[PDB]
Amino acid sequence: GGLTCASAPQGTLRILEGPQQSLSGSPLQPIPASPPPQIPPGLRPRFCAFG
Amino acid sequence: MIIPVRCFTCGKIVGNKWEAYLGLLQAEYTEGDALDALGLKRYCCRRMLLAHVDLIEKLLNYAP
Ligand SMILES: [Zn+2]
């Protein structure tokens, strides 16, 4: 029950949970481009010149 | 609030074309054909009936 002292420890192993692999996909997923505005189909002159 | 009796620019009676425009849009016309088929040919007359927020069906809910 004396509990004598011991020598100096050489190395200290650190145990830790691993990096989060297979979380990010190898291609990227962007928000798609909002489309450029279209001229709508079915546009015709509705105004006739009077008389 | 309610549809004006006359168009502002030229004085055409457009004030009788609100119920018979809701009736054409409820019967599946496009707004580019529910204004020509009411006889609104100038774009000041079409403007009054295309861009109109009839804000009295929302204001009569608060009624005694
Ligand atoms: Zn007008």
Curated annotation (Swiss-Prot), chain A:
Origin: domain of life: Eukaryota
Family: Belongs to the eukaryotic RPA34 RNA polymerase subunit family.
Known function: Component of RNA polymerase I (Pol I), a DNA-dependent RNA polymerase which synthesizes ribosomal RNA precursors using the four ribonucleoside triphosphates as substrates. Involved in UBTF-activated transcription, presumably at a step following PIC formation.
Subunit and partners: Component of the RNA polymerase I (Pol I) complex consisting of 13 subunits: a ten-subunit catalytic core composed of POLR1A/RPA1, POLR1B/RPA2, POLR1C/RPAC1, POLR1D/RPAC2, POLR1H/RPA12, POLR2E/RPABC1, POLR2F/RPABC2, POLR2H/RPABC3, POLR2K/RPABC4 and POLR2L/RPABC5; a mobile stalk subunit POLR1F/RPA43 protruding from the core and additional subunits homologous to general transcription factors POLR1E/RPA49 and POLR1G/RPA34. Forms a heterodimer with POLR1E/RPA49. Part of Pol I pre-initiation complex (PIC), in which Pol I core assembles with RRN3 and promoter-bound UTBF and SL1/TIF-IB complex.
Name listed for the protein in its UniProt record: DNA-directed RNA polymerase I subunit RPA34
Span list, region Disordered: 18-41
Record's subcellular location: Nucleus, Nucleolus; Chromosome
Biased composition (Pro residues): 29-41
More about this protein: It is in an antisense orientation to and overlaps the gene of the DNA repair enzyme ERCC1. This gene overlap is conserved in mouse, suggesting an important biological function.
Modified residues (Phosphoserine): 26, 34
Taxonomic lineage from the root: Eukaryota, Metazoa, Chordata, Craniata, Vertebrata
Curated annotation (Swiss-Prot), chain B:
Chief localisation class: nucleus
Localization per record: Nucleus; Nucleus, Nucleolus
Superkingdom of the organism of origin: Eukaryota
Membrane-spanning intervals of the chain: none
Intrachain S-S bonds: none
PROSITE patterns noted in UniProt: RNA_POL_N_8KD (PS01112)
Protein name: DNA-directed RNA polymerases I, II, and III subunit RPABC5
